[PDB]
Amino acid sequence: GAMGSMERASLIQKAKLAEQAERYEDMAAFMKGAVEKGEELSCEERNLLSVAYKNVVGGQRAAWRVLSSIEQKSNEEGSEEKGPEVREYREKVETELQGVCDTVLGLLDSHLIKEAGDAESRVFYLKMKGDYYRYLAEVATGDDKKRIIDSARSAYQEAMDISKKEMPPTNPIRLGLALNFSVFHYEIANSPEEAISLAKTTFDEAMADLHTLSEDSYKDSTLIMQLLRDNLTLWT
């Protein structure tokens, strides 16, 4: 750990600075260093961790999609052979993406999830675990693809079970978990009907609980509800 000599508090401070500078690779490295101090993460710290790696892997995924698109075209009937370079470079980006996912999954397994007892932390981390297995699933093609998919499903399912028992239906973590598990169903598990059912039921149960919220909590919940509706509009 190249961050082993830096104070935990300094790592968190620098993660916030890296965010302001839109230096998300640095942000992720600082937050990995903070996790490796071994202490549990506060709510703010968990979100710094998730923001950092979401931005890093999001860029990798966007690049992979561009390259995969170019690669598939080079393989159509009538394309001029261009050699191994597109495949090689897609593989390079894919391997770096898998590395980032494995890093995040490693942090969750050593030892964030096992120490997470409160619903807000445990559901958050299990959602992340589902998310990063989902990103691995997006690029998987081998003997392991079904097992990667089932790892994502299992993490999301455990998070869902806890969230339904322990959080109100408007809790933004619960909502974001359902949003993403719904996308998993649609895009990974070839289960569009499950995706649509989950998004719709989540939206309706949240709507009925909005009356309990403050203005600020209302804004947070309705933002994610709008994403659920956006996806439903995309899919119907």
Partner: peptide, 5 residues
């Protein structure tokens, strides 16, 4: 692509 958070 669909929205995720």
């Amino acid at each position: 692509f669909p929205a995720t958070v």
